[PDB]
Amino acid sequence: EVFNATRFASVYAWNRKRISNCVADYSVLYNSASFSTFKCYGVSPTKL
Amino acid sequence: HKNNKSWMESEFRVYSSANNCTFEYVSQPFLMDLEGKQGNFKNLREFVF
């Protein structure tokens, strides 16, 4: 949902969604070619 | 309710508000019954928490 959502917020009033009780296959994100920027802090994609 | 001339789902006279929901779940739309029947008890349900 989040990476395909039809409305993203105005930045002064940014949305938050909370992710809970689920399998985070970050692979569908970290090796997507679509993103212009992708980087992580304190964590490497090789581990998450 | 008049819409089915019988009982229906109705407003939660259970809480005023529900802030900061740390967890949520549904699974089954489970079907425990509601009708105004007047025979002896036929259903026993037991739970431990």
Curated annotation (Swiss-Prot), chain B:
Full protein stretch here: 146 to 194 of 1273
Outcome when changing W7R: In strain: Omicron/BA.2.75
Region: Disordered, residue numbers: 1-19, 28-40
Subunit composition and interactions: Binds to host ACE2. RBD also interacts with the N-linked glycan on 'Asn-90' of ACE2. Cleavage of S generates a polybasic C-terminal sequence on S1 that binds to host Neuropilin-1 (NRP1) and Neuropilin-2 (NRP2) receptors. Interacts with host integrin alpha-5/beta-1 (ITGA5:ITGB1) and with ACE2 in complex with integrin alpha-5/beta-1 (ITGA5:ITGB1). May interact via cytoplasmic c-terminus with M protein. May interact (via N-terminus) with host bilirubin and biliverdin, thereby preventing antibody binding to the SARS-CoV-2 spike NTD via an allosteric mechanism.
Job of this protein: Attaches the virion to the cell membrane by interacting with host receptor, initiating the infection. The major receptor is host ACE2. When S2/S2' has been cleaved, binding to the receptor triggers direct fusion at the cell membrane. When S2/S2' has not been cleaved, binding to the receptor results in internalization of the virus by endocytosis using host TFRC and GRM2 and leading to fusion of the virion membrane with the host endosomal membrane. Alternatively, may use NRP1/NRP2 and integrin as entry receptors.
Native source species: Severe acute respiratory syndrome coronavirus 2 (2019-nCoV)
Top-level lineage group: Viruses
Effect of F12L: In strain: A23.1, Omicron/BA.2.75
Glycan-modified residues: N4, N20
Name listed for the protein in its UniProt record: Spike protein S1
